Swiss-Prot record:
Site (described: Cleavage): 22-23
Record's bilayer topology term: Multi-pass membrane protein
Residues of the full protein shown: 1002 to 1300 of 1300
Location(s), subcellular: Cell outer membrane
Biological source species: Escherichia coli O157:H7
Disulphide-bridged cysteine pairs: none
Superkingdom to which the source organism belongs: Bacteria
Name of the molecule in the record: Autotransporter protein EspP translocator
UniProt domain Autotransporter: residue ranges: 33-299
């Protein structure tokens, strides 16, 4: 059903918004064991996933930016600005979309000597997607709209031992994006398709242990643990019309799980080793992940 296609598109948009989440301590720079007062940084990654009924997607997201920071009486204040761009391609039974969400925002991050760090990010992007769909007579349509979302998080990387730090953390994010309003007159019937002002929110709780290895012989960032993400708000209401009647739809909560990072290894100022761990929990909602492994060295 074209309503099912629209619901799948809304779920894909929610997944993209969740992916718009980047690591506070890894992608956004660690608040602990990072003495970089001012400097530039970047992080580029890729992901892949799927759902039931043949829905799947693959995306690449790259972000960069700069930051300034200074210490205080037992506190390390930090802030900065960044930009990001996430391109994605999703394949379904009757829907094939190519989306691009490029934007920018600002972030803050502070930590102390007592083992507590507070981080936050927030950015606005412009999601524009060319989607080819047969059901409802959508054709090849370009749905473009802005989307501003900001999240906050708090972690406590307490010293579990001399070779690891135990970090419990929580996060909560709120985001708003304009709906996809277009006419389905290409199908013969009116079938007006539009959505209300979506204002999704999502919280998450995650625990981890991080190996603070050094010595240029270990020099790795081994981490383990688990985290669970539950939607704080799902207000993605949309309206569809048909000859027999009209319908309205909205979103519900989620119970997504997570995993850890594989190696994230290095030795010296000329070697960097990478390896990612992925999970494909097809039992719950036919979910999946994307992982990679590479390393860089020069003579």
């Amino acid at each position: 059903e074209a309503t099912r296609n629209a619901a799948a598109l809304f779920s894909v948009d929610y997944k993209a918004f969740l992916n718009e989440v980047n690591n506070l301590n890894k992608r956004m720079g660690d608040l602990r064991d990072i003495n970089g007062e001012a400097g530039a940084w970047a992080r580029i990654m890729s992901g892949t996933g799927s759902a039931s009924g043949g829905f799947s997607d693959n995306y690449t997201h790259v972000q960069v930016g700069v930051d300034k920071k200074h210490e205080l009486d037992g506190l390390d204040l930090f802030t900065g600005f960044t930009v990001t761009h996430t391109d994605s391609s999703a394949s379904a039974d009757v829907f094939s979309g190519k989306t691009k969400s490029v934007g920018a925002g600002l972030y803050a991050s502070a930590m102390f000597d007592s083992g507590a760090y507070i981080d936050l990010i927030g950015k606005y992007v412009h999601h524009d997607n060319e989607y080819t769909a047969t059901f409802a007579g959508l054709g090849t349509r370009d749905y473009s709209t802005h989307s501003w979302y900001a999240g906050a998080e708090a972690g406590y990387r307490y010293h579990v031992t001399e070779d690891a730090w135990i970090e419990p953390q929580a996060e909560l994010v709120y985001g708003s994006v304009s709906g996809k309003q277009f006419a389905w007159k290409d199908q013969g019937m009116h079938l007006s398709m539009k959505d209300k002002d979506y204002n999704p929110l999502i919280g998450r709780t995650g625990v981890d242990v991080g190996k603070s290895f050094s010595g240029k012989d270990w020099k790795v960032t081994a981490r383990a643990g688990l985290g669970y993400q539950f939607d704080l708000l799902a207000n993605g209401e949309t309206v569809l019309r048909d000859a027999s009647g009209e319908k309205r739809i909205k979103g519900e909560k989620d119970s997504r799980m997570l995993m850890s990072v594989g190696l994230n290894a290095e030795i010296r100022d000329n070697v960097r080793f990478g390896l990612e761990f992925e999970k494909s929990a097809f039992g719950k909602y036919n979910v999946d992940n994307a992982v990679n492994a590479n390393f860089r060295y020069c003579f």
